[PDB]
């Protein structure tokens, strides 16, 4: 091809870095805020394979846009990619053919990356050893405090901070201080991110425990350092490659003491900050859960969904449990991951549920890196839950599936009661890489549900879910502003109770193991009904109680209709209808009124002659059959909105 | 009170479903517009009752968001009878009781497009893609097509705004007890009685009641029509859709076609020029006598060719297709100087392709007679219940029917000029109108194309010098529209009306609109696979294997469905000698059928249009079947 | 596994398939009888009325039965009880 020929690229797309290998020509392209990775074949002349980065585009672009680079020898060598901040972005291919969720190498930025193809010779008798190799030479920058943190040296960090404060007293180190604040590692991570990363647990209970203790000491030193007080506000508000502030990274990585330290430091900073058109909440939520984050990265939801892998108690023996298949990691055709692994390990992958689920066990360890094998500290987890409940308003926000935190917790408890009865305790009666599997099944869902039900704001948000104020993304009535006003009137007249009906059904008829959850909910409702000092609390409590009682009445009516009142054995009640009766008795003056309204609703068509014809049906003689039918009726999802427009 | 409660509740449920449909995901199983909701193609009885009970409990306290109400309107026939009786009473007593510029009759919607009891959308604010969807998508016209999606979604002047009564407030609420407490809570010579229809403490007009329960009335008319619609003074029949009107028209045509003594018995050939010449001569000869009486009718119309044996109705359908396609070709017409013993093509497309309006010429008596003859052949197609594909514009058929052309016909004439004039008047409402009008410098004279005659014509006398001003733009626009609706083509439209009325009485021609006339004359706009599925009977004369003939029809429908427009039209031509299917089953004098002959390797399928039947061999090979069918339908 | 129909003259009973595609959800057509639905709704109403009767029967001994035994109970006074009885009677007047 004596004449140069064009390579087709999309319009209005900037090229960041290009290099050429045997496979074709590799490039990184940016349009707007969308950074991709393309490989063109010369014969095709167009974009043969284009891939999207799993990490965020803003993090990849970094502070400087001209540091992006691609390195390849040219004939047979891998691609080394270098992002905007100057560090190295790992590349790998999943089973579908995209860029895997990178495992950060903690390498500091590389100033120069030499790479060469070198043919190995003098091989004895032409052995099986490969004849050629790539020699990679690297020039890595000398970031003092970043490496000090990553190496977990308390003394080094203390000395560096003392020298820094002495220089600040000398008032001659402003530029270097600003430069140090701008230091980064892989994943657009600042110093606090490094402290959090080294604070992560490694195994269940330089020594690893000593390393963790030094990491906690370093994090506390950074938090309480006098010099870095004006700079902690920006560091705690900085987002890494996954859009996580240091607190969010701490929660996700199960470094709960670190998360508590960061949260109290954030509250301290928010209290001591100027009010120049900035509120306390707007400056605290900016560093706890910044606006724009997806609901599945909310610290409270991540805290509740961290749990532990099902393999950690089931062992290698099959157990009847819900099974998820992931397309990206390759967990297909008898390779299955548990419901705990579908919420953390595969958060973002093309993971779905296997409807036809035989007895199975989780093998997430043999297909991908499992972050659910190690469980953190229970007391710190509960304390962080308490503080996030009493400090922010995160519990009001739902998650990506449109369900409130209370609904998610109740469903988790209902599923766990069924699954954990299969637990085989460690009876005293070749595989070395198999994960440790001698720990109890998680018991955090029950405690979390009990504590959240005690919260008035959380219960108010859950019971009033689907009302005029509270709305979930997965509802056709969420966005209706683009419709005709006549249709908007009809869509705004009605209120949402599908989520509340699911909540009540899973709390009364599915959470059969325990009764204290319903008692907790009733206690909170009663406390707020009888509250008088707080203005307007009684009326709000009355409204919440009426809505909850209507939901309970619906569940009770459906259950009673399904069942048949057999005189034999004089049972007189199933367990769920007993729970509904307990709710009615505890809130009698309002329960009777709501029952009157429900009865009128049921009887009006009969006495107006407009009943809709229905085929006869038999009545269940057992509660196990009555639970079904009601399960199909209540455990349903609202109608999703119309995609796009 | 009982009827008001039931009807308001059911209207609230249907309206909620429509709103949710418009706001939901069509792919979800719970969506109203999903296949699973067809109610004929495809849970447990316990599940059904539990859904009903849960819906009843939820709708009682406005908690029904994101789920369709569970109702069976087919079980409300007694409510329909009660509503019909009460509406009859209201209408009877109400009948016993009984300018220019912006508010001009030309800018107001007529009964063809308007809704009873609902304020029509303003002709200016809403664009064409939403005000009149039929103009933007002319293929939406089907035998079962809602008036809402054809001419926009109407609005009603209701709700609490300046209203403190039950009827003044719209339904909204979905239960049946709140909508029962609402009607309860609100509560001389003998020849001058003058009733008042007080009833609900206010003067009640059937128009606002019809608008209040529009969806319920539409569903009642669609479902309850064999029993409720047969009652005297029924309003479901009065507000009937296309089905009732087409059945009535076809039965009236059958009545008007079965009392004559002499048939038509034309004499035409397959060429281009001599076909037209013989057609005109025979039509003139048949309709000729001193002081002709009331419009004469033909019991039957038979077409005979020269050097081509053939008898039946297939030849008539082929003649209709050929004469229509010939008159719609853009080329110079052969001279018609032999009628008594200038040559621009008859029709052209002003707007969207497929729709035609008359092209004026020198107004010679030959051209006028030709237009009268085309009106006569349209009337013949109406009477003989045969599809004659000539798709005229909406205003042309509207003036043929004798109705008054409004400004919304300009949308069907040419959408681009409609949008331009709408934007012009919308800017004219603003203060900067004078500057724009002076900049473009309009005048009461239009630069008509050579199609319209060329040159330039003055709208009103001494109006060339007079410019168009924002204080007088409306008249201008009206004149503009008028000069492209009736002024240019007065003579051709009058000739077509005379020709059409020469064969059909005025009385039967009434109670018809533009869309129904288009569906009866031109058939369905495009040939649909499901339409063929609805009327096609398979018979087999081989009897070789059950599975073979069971799969042959599936393969035939699969290969037909994958075809495109032109080859589908060719297939329907080779089958029934008419490109367009009839709107309903009635219209096919024989039922279309397909006969599976014993399998053969090389025998192209045949068709007899006398009974409109295909004879296809049992083609084992699919590609050979496709090739044979394509080559068979290639010929015309 | 679920095929469509390609034939004619398939009209048994019927009278509901003529509904518009937009409203087919609001239309139907082992028994599917009105009286079964009426009986089932009356049964549900009876269940609710029995529950209301039991709750109203617990009022005179509310403190001994509900308040002490259940950890979370709503305080109830005499005027609240009489207003409750009046409310229930007023709601049950129409069906009565
Ligand atoms: Zn797992
Ligand atoms: Zn995965
Ligand atoms: Zn895992």
PDB file of N, CA and C in Angstrom, chain A residues 419-475:
ATOM      1  N   UNK A 419     -33.231 -20.013  53.692  1.00  0.00           N
ATOM      2  CA  UNK A 419     -31.964 -20.596  53.256  1.00  0.00           C
ATOM      3  C   UNK A 419     -31.133 -21.112  54.426  1.00  0.00           C
ATOM      4  N   UNK A 420     -31.050 -20.351  55.518  1.00  0.00           N
ATOM      5  CA  UNK A 420     -30.131 -20.671  56.601  1.00  0.00           C
ATOM      6  C   UNK A 420     -30.583 -21.853  57.444  1.00  0.00           C
ATOM      7  N   UNK A 421     -31.817 -22.329  57.277  1.00  0.00           N
ATOM      8  CA  UNK A 421     -32.205 -23.566  57.940  1.00  0.00           C
ATOM      9  C   UNK A 421     -31.449 -24.766  57.393  1.00  0.00           C
ATOM     10  N   UNK A 422     -30.789 -24.613  56.249  1.00  0.00           N
ATOM     11  CA  UNK A 422     -29.956 -25.643  55.651  1.00  0.00           C
ATOM     12  C   UNK A 422     -28.531 -25.617  56.177  1.00  0.00           C
ATOM     13  N   UNK A 423     -28.243 -24.762  57.151  1.00  0.00           N
ATOM     14  CA  UNK A 423     -26.895 -24.651  57.684  1.00  0.00           C
ATOM     15  C   UNK A 423     -26.526 -25.902  58.466  1.00  0.00           C
ATOM     16  N   UNK A 424     -25.367 -26.474  58.144  1.00  0.00           N
ATOM     17  CA  UNK A 424     -24.847 -27.617  58.875  1.00  0.00           C
ATOM     18  C   UNK A 424     -23.722 -27.135  59.774  1.00  0.00           C
ATOM     19  N   UNK A 425     -23.894 -27.128  61.091  1.00  0.00           N
ATOM     20  CA  UNK A 425     -22.836 -26.639  61.982  1.00  0.00           C
ATOM     21  C   UNK A 425     -21.582 -27.484  61.854  1.00  0.00           C
ATOM     22  N   UNK A 426     -20.440 -26.994  62.342  1.00  0.00           N
ATOM     23  CA  UNK A 426     -19.188 -27.741  62.163  1.00  0.00           C
ATOM     24  C   UNK A 426     -19.150 -29.016  62.987  1.00  0.00           C
ATOM     25  N   UNK A 427     -19.787 -30.067  62.476  1.00  0.00           N
ATOM     26  CA  UNK A 427     -19.796 -31.349  63.166  1.00  0.00           C
ATOM     27  C   UNK A 427     -18.382 -31.907  63.273  1.00  0.00           C
ATOM     28  N   UNK A 428     -18.041 -32.402  64.457  1.00  0.00           N
ATOM     29  CA  UNK A 428     -16.721 -32.967  64.722  1.00  0.00           C
ATOM     30  C   UNK A 428     -16.844 -34.475  64.524  1.00  0.00           C
ATOM     31  N   UNK A 429     -16.533 -34.927  63.314  1.00  0.00           N
ATOM     32  CA  UNK A 429     -16.603 -36.345  62.981  1.00  0.00           C
ATOM     33  C   UNK A 429     -15.403 -36.767  62.139  1.00  0.00           C
ATOM     34  N   UNK A 430      -6.874 -31.803  49.980  1.00  0.00           N
ATOM     35  CA  UNK A 430      -6.245 -31.749  48.665  1.00  0.00           C
ATOM     36  C   UNK A 430      -6.425 -30.371  48.035  1.00  0.00           C
ATOM     37  N   UNK A 431      -7.576 -29.754  48.294  1.00  0.00           N
ATOM     38  CA  UNK A 431      -7.890 -28.430  47.768  1.00  0.00           C
ATOM     39  C   UNK A 431      -7.413 -27.388  48.774  1.00  0.00           C
ATOM     40  N   UNK A 432      -6.409 -26.603  48.387  1.00  0.00           N
ATOM     41  CA  UNK A 432      -5.829 -25.598  49.268  1.00  0.00           C
ATOM     42  C   UNK A 432      -6.253 -24.178  48.928  1.00  0.00           C
ATOM     43  N   UNK A 433      -6.586 -23.904  47.668  1.00  0.00           N
ATOM     44  CA  UNK A 433      -7.034 -22.578  47.265  1.00  0.00           C
ATOM     45  C   UNK A 433      -8.525 -22.364  47.486  1.00  0.00           C
ATOM     46  N   UNK A 434      -9.238 -23.371  47.981  1.00  0.00           N
ATOM     47  CA  UNK A 434     -10.659 -23.219  48.249  1.00  0.00           C
ATOM     48  C   UNK A 434     -10.871 -22.210  49.377  1.00  0.00           C
ATOM     49  N   UNK A 435     -11.846 -21.313  49.244  1.00  0.00           N
ATOM     50  CA  UNK A 435     -12.058 -20.293  50.275  1.00  0.00           C
ATOM     51  C   UNK A 435     -12.394 -20.904  51.626  1.00  0.00           C
ATOM     52  N   UNK A 436     -11.997 -20.196  52.680  1.00  0.00           N
ATOM     53  CA  UNK A 436     -12.346 -20.597  54.035  1.00  0.00           C
ATOM     54  C   UNK A 436     -13.860 -20.646  54.192  1.00  0.00           C
ATOM     55  N   UNK A 437     -14.365 -21.765  54.709  1.00  0.00           N
ATOM     56  CA  UNK A 437     -15.803 -22.006  54.783  1.00  0.00           C
ATOM     57  C   UNK A 437     -16.188 -22.559  56.152  1.00  0.00           C
ATOM     58  N   UNK A 438     -15.701 -21.926  57.213  1.00  0.00           N
ATOM     59  CA  UNK A 438     -16.039 -22.332  58.572  1.00  0.00           C
ATOM     60  C   UNK A 438     -16.534 -21.138  59.378  1.00  0.00           C
ATOM     61  N   UNK A 439     -17.435 -20.356  58.788  1.00  0.00           N
ATOM     62  CA  UNK A 439     -18.019 -19.207  59.460  1.00  0.00           C
ATOM     63  C   UNK A 439     -19.535 -19.258  59.342  1.00  0.00           C
ATOM     64  N   UNK A 440     -20.201 -18.706  60.351  1.00  0.00           N
ATOM     65  CA  UNK A 440     -21.649 -18.766  60.427  1.00  0.00           C
ATOM     66  C   UNK A 440     -22.286 -17.948  59.305  1.00  0.00           C
ATOM     67  N   UNK A 441     -23.501 -18.303  58.896  1.00  0.00           N
ATOM     68  CA  UNK A 441     -24.216 -17.468  57.942  1.00  0.00           C
ATOM     69  C   UNK A 441     -24.464 -16.095  58.526  1.00  0.00           C
ATOM     70  N   UNK A 442     -24.541 -15.065  57.685  1.00  0.00           N
ATOM     71  CA  UNK A 442     -24.667 -13.699  58.203  1.00  0.00           C
ATOM     72  C   UNK A 442     -25.950 -13.511  58.999  1.00  0.00           C
ATOM     73  N   UNK A 443     -25.852 -12.715  60.064  1.00  0.00           N
ATOM     74  CA  UNK A 443     -26.993 -12.399  60.913  1.00  0.00           C
ATOM     75  C   UNK A 443     -27.224 -10.897  61.015  1.00  0.00           C
ATOM     76  N   UNK A 444     -26.735 -10.127  60.044  1.00  0.00           N
ATOM     77  CA  UNK A 444     -26.838  -8.676  60.104  1.00  0.00           C
ATOM     78  C   UNK A 444     -28.182  -8.153  59.620  1.00  0.00           C
ATOM     79  N   UNK A 445     -28.884  -8.900  58.769  1.00  0.00           N
ATOM     80  CA  UNK A 445     -30.133  -8.396  58.206  1.00  0.00           C
ATOM     81  C   UNK A 445     -31.188  -8.180  59.285  1.00  0.00           C
ATOM     82  N   UNK A 446     -31.305  -9.116  60.229  1.00  0.00           N
ATOM     83  CA  UNK A 446     -32.301  -8.982  61.288  1.00  0.00           C
ATOM     84  C   UNK A 446     -32.010  -7.772  62.165  1.00  0.00           C
ATOM     85  N   UNK A 447     -30.751  -7.614  62.575  1.00  0.00           N
ATOM     86  CA  UNK A 447     -30.376  -6.481  63.412  1.00  0.00           C
ATOM     87  C   UNK A 447     -30.593  -5.166  62.680  1.00  0.00           C
ATOM     88  N   UNK A 448     -30.223  -5.119  61.400  1.00  0.00           N
ATOM     89  CA  UNK A 448     -30.416  -3.906  60.619  1.00  0.00           C
ATOM     90  C   UNK A 448     -31.891  -3.565  60.493  1.00  0.00           C
ATOM     91  N   UNK A 449     -32.734  -4.567  60.244  1.00  0.00           N
ATOM     92  CA  UNK A 449     -34.164  -4.316  60.126  1.00  0.00           C
ATOM     93  C   UNK A 449     -34.742  -3.818  61.442  1.00  0.00           C
ATOM     94  N   UNK A 450     -34.330  -4.423  62.559  1.00  0.00           N
ATOM     95  CA  UNK A 450     -34.804  -3.963  63.860  1.00  0.00           C
ATOM     96  C   UNK A 450     -34.405  -2.519  64.109  1.00  0.00           C
ATOM     97  N   UNK A 451     -33.165  -2.158  63.779  1.00  0.00           N
ATOM     98  CA  UNK A 451     -32.708  -0.803  64.059  1.00  0.00           C
ATOM     99  C   UNK A 451     -33.367   0.215  63.136  1.00  0.00           C
ATOM    100  N   UNK A 452     -33.555  -0.134  61.864  1.00  0.00           N
ATOM    101  CA  UNK A 452     -34.158   0.803  60.922  1.00  0.00           C
ATOM    102  C   UNK A 452     -35.638   0.997  61.227  1.00  0.00           C
ATOM    103  N   UNK A 453     -36.335  -0.076  61.614  1.00  0.00           N
ATOM    104  CA  UNK A 453     -37.744   0.060  61.974  1.00  0.00           C
ATOM    105  C   UNK A 453     -37.934   0.990  63.164  1.00  0.00           C
ATOM    106  N   UNK A 454     -36.945   1.065  64.057  1.00  0.00           N
ATOM    107  CA  UNK A 454     -37.009   2.005  65.168  1.00  0.00           C
ATOM    108  C   UNK A 454     -36.878   3.452  64.716  1.00  0.00           C
ATOM    109  N   UNK A 455     -36.415   3.687  63.491  1.00  0.00           N
ATOM    110  CA  UNK A 455     -36.240   5.038  62.976  1.00  0.00           C
ATOM    111  C   UNK A 455     -37.553   5.538  62.390  1.00  0.00           C
ATOM    112  N   UNK A 456     -37.951   6.748  62.786  1.00  0.00           N
ATOM    113  CA  UNK A 456     -39.215   7.297  62.312  1.00  0.00           C
ATOM    114  C   UNK A 456     -39.123   7.751  60.864  1.00  0.00           C
ATOM    115  N   UNK A 457     -38.011   8.382  60.484  1.00  0.00           N
ATOM    116  CA  UNK A 457     -37.874   8.857  59.113  1.00  0.00           C
ATOM    117  C   UNK A 457     -37.882   7.699  58.125  1.00  0.00           C
ATOM    118  N   UNK A 458     -37.179   6.613  58.450  1.00  0.00           N
ATOM    119  CA  UNK A 458     -37.120   5.467  57.550  1.00  0.00           C
ATOM    120  C   UNK A 458     -38.489   4.825  57.380  1.00  0.00           C
ATOM    121  N   UNK A 459     -39.189   4.594  58.490  1.00  0.00           N
ATOM    122  CA  UNK A 459     -40.508   3.979  58.416  1.00  0.00           C
ATOM    123  C   UNK A 459     -41.500   4.887  57.705  1.00  0.00           C
ATOM    124  N   UNK A 460     -41.414   6.195  57.950  1.00  0.00           N
ATOM    125  CA  UNK A 460     -42.281   7.138  57.256  1.00  0.00           C
ATOM    126  C   UNK A 460     -42.022   7.119  55.758  1.00  0.00           C
ATOM    127  N   UNK A 461     -40.752   7.074  55.358  1.00  0.00           N
ATOM    128  CA  UNK A 461     -40.428   7.020  53.940  1.00  0.00           C
ATOM    129  C   UNK A 461     -40.923   5.727  53.307  1.00  0.00           C
ATOM    130  N   UNK A 462     -40.810   4.607  54.024  1.00  0.00           N
ATOM    131  CA  UNK A 462     -41.232   3.331  53.453  1.00  0.00           C
ATOM    132  C   UNK A 462     -42.747   3.249  53.327  1.00  0.00           C
ATOM    133  N   UNK A 463     -43.470   3.599  54.389  1.00  0.00           N
ATOM    134  CA  UNK A 463     -44.923   3.488  54.352  1.00  0.00           C
ATOM    135  C   UNK A 463     -45.511   4.495  53.371  1.00  0.00           C
ATOM    136  N   UNK A 464     -44.909   5.676  53.271  1.00  0.00           N
ATOM    137  CA  UNK A 464     -45.347   6.694  52.327  1.00  0.00           C
ATOM    138  C   UNK A 464     -44.681   6.556  50.964  1.00  0.00           C
ATOM    139  N   UNK A 465     -44.053   5.417  50.689  1.00  0.00           N
ATOM    140  CA  UNK A 465     -43.490   5.170  49.371  1.00  0.00           C
ATOM    141  C   UNK A 465     -44.605   5.061  48.343  1.00  0.00           C
ATOM    142  N   UNK A 466     -44.399   5.686  47.189  1.00  0.00           N
ATOM    143  CA  UNK A 466     -45.424   5.731  46.174  1.00  0.00           C
ATOM    144  C   UNK A 466     -46.456   6.817  46.360  1.00  0.00           C
ATOM    145  N   UNK A 467     -46.330   7.641  47.394  1.00  0.00           N
ATOM    146  CA  UNK A 467     -47.240   8.757  47.601  1.00  0.00           C
ATOM    147  C   UNK A 467     -46.830   9.915  46.695  1.00  0.00           C
ATOM    148  N   UNK A 468     -47.390  11.099  46.948  1.00  0.00           N
ATOM    149  CA  UNK A 468     -47.132  12.243  46.081  1.00  0.00           C
ATOM    150  C   UNK A 468     -45.660  12.632  46.093  1.00  0.00           C
ATOM    151  N   UNK A 469     -45.039  12.648  47.271  1.00  0.00           N
ATOM    152  CA  UNK A 469     -43.641  13.054  47.367  1.00  0.00           C
ATOM    153  C   UNK A 469     -42.706  11.930  46.932  1.00  0.00           C
ATOM    154  N   UNK A 470     -42.778  10.788  47.609  1.00  0.00           N
ATOM    155  CA  UNK A 470     -41.860   9.692  47.332  1.00  0.00           C
ATOM    156  C   UNK A 470     -42.231   8.999  46.027  1.00  0.00           C
ATOM    157  N   UNK A 471     -41.246   8.838  45.146  1.00  0.00           N
ATOM    158  CA  UNK A 471     -41.444   8.163  43.872  1.00  0.00           C
ATOM    159  C   UNK A 471     -40.175   7.410  43.505  1.00  0.00           C
ATOM    160  N   UNK A 472     -40.347   6.229  42.907  1.00  0.00           N
ATOM    161  CA  UNK A 472     -39.238   5.379  42.513  1.00  0.00           C
ATOM    162  C   UNK A 472     -39.036   5.418  41.004  1.00  0.00           C
ATOM    163  N   UNK A 473     -37.796   5.263  40.535  1.00  0.00           N
ATOM    164  CA  UNK A 473     -37.553   5.310  39.086  1.00  0.00           C
ATOM    165  C   UNK A 473     -38.277   4.229  38.307  1.00  0.00           C
ATOM    166  N   UNK A 474     -38.476   3.052  38.891  1.00  0.00           N
ATOM    167  CA  UNK A 474     -39.106   1.937  38.184  1.00  0.00           C
ATOM    168  C   UNK A 474     -40.623   1.954  38.334  1.00  0.00           C
ATOM    169  N   UNK A 475     -41.234   3.089  38.012  1.00  0.00           N
ATOM    170  CA  UNK A 475     -42.680   3.238  38.040  1.00  0.00           C
ATOM    171  C   UNK A 475     -43.106   4.138  36.894  1.00  0.00           C
TER     172      UNK A 475
END
